């Protein structure tokens, strides 16, 4: 059989091959011809005005054994031009003798796993945020750091959403193979110029609304400490307590009974608003999950329309200008992991210590935090430093490529381990299955 | 053998400009670059530029850079040429070309085969 | 840029006399192209690749050069010969022409 992965390191090949050779080889002193370029596809030289140049087919190509001698042809016209046809696409090529299998097999598999995955997470995710948005009872500051967390990979959902209509908007324009690879070249001038920017935005933001998810969980285990309310707004002094109800002073929230409600509103001890402080953080946890990403993502755009905006800003080949969005996500991925080192060092001494239990919110949440946190920065510290050393990291990016079709479904984590994991959220589910019946 | 069809003859005072039409009856997916050339009498034949239809981007002679201005229309497939700041000097004929090639095989077998009637300019008060 | 020299101005021939005229580039050029302009009509693809003939050019008609130097020639000359002939350039640009050569014939 034809490997799918495989006949992308034989393409990568090609391309280097094409790279050395239209680099390596001489001008050819005509002064006036048309230039020589890669059509991410075949490799082209230098043409003679007014020649058809005759190329030989992709070696990379499944079926390059069943076409041999190749004929994919260009014409360079005594302009100095390639031949053009269609100037808001790329310039006319032959590639009807070097047309049909395995690879595209698993290539369509790949990319259906990843748009299901991807519709998958996103219903999921807009019904979560729906669920802690629509119930009253869930209001809380606890929530709110979650609904954002929803919110970047909702947008960066539907970022996918958009780049794939215009994939599907260009390649409707009729049936042809060379015209099913030109659709590509069409949208990857004009569609995936501010998409993409954004998508990088959402991933930005995903790694720094997971730093405040982990921020907050250490500042409600770091947590004398007081609470407040989140309906009416009440605040319960500790050192002042409620003995006017059975309360003495001097006792925290934490050992008030479950059979408890706001002596101002009425709604119940489980509707407390966390440290009155938790109000005016959340603020600054909205200023580190999306302004500290346009701190980085526009500066990156910027200078990547200044100064290298050909091809959608995806060849990064001149100069490393993509550190400005690798430095600042992998230093928001060593102090998850190191907030995530330190979660647990406090949950076993608090735990051990009697000071804490199981049956918690701040455990309940822990379980989750301390879950997403591993699996959504782990690759992004390993690869991070140690393969940037070299140009290793080149194939590896290849291998991120096969990854993003696979962190598809990260979305859909967050949905569930945020949301339908909450035993808060069960409640309401029980809630409104108890009021039908 | 007179294959593009050019706009009239003008008469225009110095200083103004002129903007003339080289209406083709349909570009060739080998030919669609019209090119223009000015035959001042004693000057000789002059290459002004030429204007891609296609993607509407023009190409000039340095010389004529700032002098000529070339457009194409999408609908009517017609290329344009404009002459602003206009003096003595550019009272000349001029013409509308496309290169016809001579065997597609072989790199450099062409020549301006299609030719433009030619549209004269008068600059004079 | 480059510049297309052609000479002689105006050559006059005899019927059945060698015509012979030149066209001498600033630069070397690979290929050399000429035009038959007949006064009273746009100019005409005549030679072109230095030595290939346009079709309906008579045999007579024959293209010659390299490098910088080249030109157009007539064996046995015939009065319907009679017309301006510009060599150009298709090489670099600005694509240059020549002054042409106004071709009478002696009687």
């Known amino acids: 059989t034809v490997s799918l992965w495989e006949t992308v390191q034989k393409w990568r090949e090609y391309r280097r091959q094409c790279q050395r050779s239209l680099t390596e080889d001489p001008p050819p002193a005509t002064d006036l011809f048309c230039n020589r370029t890669f059509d991410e596809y075949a490799c082209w030289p230098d043409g003679e005005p007014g020649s058809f140049v005759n190329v030989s087919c992709p070696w990379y190509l499944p079926w390059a054994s069943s076409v041999p001698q190749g004929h994919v042809y260009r014409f360079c016209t005594a302009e100095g031009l390639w031949l053009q046809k269609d100037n808001s696409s790329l310039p006319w090529r032959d590639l009807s003798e070097c047309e049909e299998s395995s690879p595209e097999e698993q290539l369509l598999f790949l990319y259906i796993i990843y748009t299901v995955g991807y519709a998958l997470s996103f219903s999921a995710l807009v019904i979560a945020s729906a669920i802690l948005l629509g119930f009253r009872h869930l209001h809380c500051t606890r929530n709110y750091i979650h609904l954002n967390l929803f919110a970047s990979f909702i947008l960066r959902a539907l970022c996918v959403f958009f780049k794939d209509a215009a994939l599907k908007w260009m390649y409707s324009t009729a049936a042809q193979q060379h015209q099913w690879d030109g659709l590509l070249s069409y949208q990857d001038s004009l569609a995936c110029r501010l998409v993409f920017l954004l998508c990088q935005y959402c991933v930005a933001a995903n790694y720094y609304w997971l730093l405040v998810e982990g921020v907050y969980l250490y500042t409600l285990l770091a947590f004398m400490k007081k609470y407040t309310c989140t309906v009416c707004g009440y605040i319960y002094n500790p050192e002042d307590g409620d003995p006017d109800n059975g309360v003495n002073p001097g006792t925290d929230f934490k050992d008030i009974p479950d059979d408890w409600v706001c002596p101002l509103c009425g709604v119940g001890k489980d509707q407390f608003e966390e440290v009155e402080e938790e109000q005016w953080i959340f603020r600054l946890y909205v200023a580190i999950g999306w302004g500290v990403p346009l701190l980085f993502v526009v500066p990156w755009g910027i200078v990547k329309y200044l100064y290298e905006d050909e091809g959608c800003w995806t060849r990064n080949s001149n100069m490393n200008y993509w550190l400005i969005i690798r430095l600042p996500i992998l230093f928001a991925c060593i102090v998850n992991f190191l907030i995530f080192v330190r979660v647990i060092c406090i949950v076993v001494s608090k735990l051990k210590a009697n000071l804490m239990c199981k049956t918690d919110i701040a455990f309940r949440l822990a379980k989750s935090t301390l879950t997403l946190i591993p699996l959504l920065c782990t690759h992004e510290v390993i690869f991070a430093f140690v393969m940037d050393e070299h140009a290793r990291g080149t194939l590896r990016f290849i291998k991120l490529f096969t990854d993003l079709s696979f962190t598809s479904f990260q979305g859909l984590m967050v949905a569930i381990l945020y949301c339908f994991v909450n035993n808060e959220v069960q409640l309401e589910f029980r809630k409104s299955w108890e009021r039908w019946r | 053998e007179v294959q593009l069809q050019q706009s009239g003859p003008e008469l225009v005072k110095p200083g103004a400009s002129v903007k003339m039409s080289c209406k083709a009856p349909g570009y060739t997916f080998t030919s669609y670059v019209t090119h223009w050339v000015k035959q001042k009498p004693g000057q000789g034949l002059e290459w002004i530029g030429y204007?891609?239809?296609?993607?509407?981007?023009?190409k000039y002679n340095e010389k004529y850079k700032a002098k000529a201005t070339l457009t194409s229309d999408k609908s009517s497939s017609t290329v344009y040429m404009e002459l602003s700041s206009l003096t003595s000097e550019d009272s000349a004929v001029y013409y509308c070309?496309?290169?016809?090639?001579?065997?597609?095989?072989?790199?450099?077998?062409?020549?301006?085969?299609?030719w433009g009637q030619g549209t004269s300019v008068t600059v004079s008060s | 840029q480059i510049v297309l020299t052609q000479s002689p101005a105006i050559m006059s021939a005899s019927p059945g006399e060698k015509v012979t005229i030149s066209c001498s580039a600033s630069?070397?050029?690979?290929?050399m192209y000429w035009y038959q302009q007949k006064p009273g009509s746009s100019p005409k693809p005549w030679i072109y690749?230095?030595?290939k003939l346009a079709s309906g050019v008579p045999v007579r008609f024959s293209g010659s050069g390299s490098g910088t130097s080249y030109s157009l020639t007539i064996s046995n000359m015939e009065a319907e010969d009679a017309a301006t002939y510009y060599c150009?350039?298709?090489?670099?640009?600005?694509?240059?022409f020549g002054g042409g050569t106004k071709l009478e014939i002696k009687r």
């Open positions: 070309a496309r290169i016809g090639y001579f065997r597609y095989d072989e790199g450099g077998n062409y020549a301006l085969d299609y």
């Open positions: 630069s070397s050029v690979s290929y």
């Open positions: 690749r230095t030595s």
């Open positions: 204007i891609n239809p296609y993607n509407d981007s023009p």
């Open positions: 150009q350039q298709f090489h670099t640009y600005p694509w240059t």
